Amino acid sequence: GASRLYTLVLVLQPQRVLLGMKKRGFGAGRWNGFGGKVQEGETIEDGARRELQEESGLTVDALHKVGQIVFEFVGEPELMDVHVFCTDSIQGTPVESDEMRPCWFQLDQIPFKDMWPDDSYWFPLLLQKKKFHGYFKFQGQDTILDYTLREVDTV
Ligand SMILES: CNc1nc(OCCOC)nc2c1[nH]c(=O)n2Cc1ccccc1
């Protein structure tokens, strides 16, 4: 059907991953990555950089696309086509805002119970830097009715 473009950025380093507790708005009460809608006149990668900076205060040397996930929320007018980026190359410190509190998690302490339920499926691939295409059919924000996830050579 009709779909909208989104980006999702994970700051993933050898020993730790950066997530942000949402205090308000989309994903409130969960540890989320950084992202949002891609705008007209910017590339998907430019949009990922922009959202990372707007949300966390971070600027990076480079980012790479590691996956794509299509979300179907039952009853919503459009699909969400999310392009997933990864980067280790931060140039400063994350900053807490009125919207978000940043936290570095050790890789054996990733808080899946306090994250979106789909994350449990594709994180093991992200952590191995294995590229992936996924699809998740949701009923509301807690329930996965169906999904697919495959390792790909090209996103
Ligand atoms: C780290 N896992 C996840 N992080 C976010 O950060 C929000 C920034 O992206 C807009 N969102 C996640 C997320 N895992 C997850 O399911 N979502 C929900 C989502 C659904 C549809 C479009 C975008 C995000």
Curated annotation (Swiss-Prot):
Ranges of residues in domain Nudix hydrolase: 2-131
Mutagenesis or variant effect for residue 56 to R: Loss of activity
Outcome following mutation: residue 119 to A/N: Mildly decreased 2-oxo-dATPase activity, nearly abolishes 8-oxo-dGTPase activity
A GO CC annotation given for this chain: cytosol
Motif (Nudix box): 36-57
EC number annotated for this UniProt entry: 3.6.1.56, 3.6.1.-
Catalyzed chemical reaction(s): 2-oxo-dATP + H2O = 2-oxo-dAMP + diphosphate + H(+); 2-oxo-ATP + H2O = 2-oxo-AMP + diphosphate + H(+); 8-oxo-dGTP + H2O = 8-oxo-dGMP + diphosphate + H(+); 8-oxo-dATP + H2O = 8-oxo-dAMP + diphosphate + H(+)
Effect of residue 26 to A: Reduces 2-oxo-dATPase and 8-oxo-dGTPase activities
Binding sites annotated in the UniProt record for 8-oxo-dGTP: 7, 22, 32, 34-37, 116-119
Binding positions (N(6)-methyl-AMP): 7, 22, 116-119
Gene Ontology BP term (one): purine nucleoside catabolic process
pH dependence of activity: Optimum pH is 7.8-8.2 with 8-oxo-dGTP as substrate, and 8.0-8.5 with 2-oxo-dATP as substrate.
Effect of residue 55 to A: Loss of ability to prevent DNA damage. Expected to cause loss of enzyme activity
Amino-acid positions noted as binding 8-oxo-ATP in the UniProt annotation, renumbered to this chain: 26, 34-37, 51, 55, 116-119
Oligomer and partners: Monomer.
Name by which UniProt lists this protein: Oxidized purine nucleoside triphosphate hydrolase
Originating organism: Homo sapiens
Gene for this chain: NUDT1
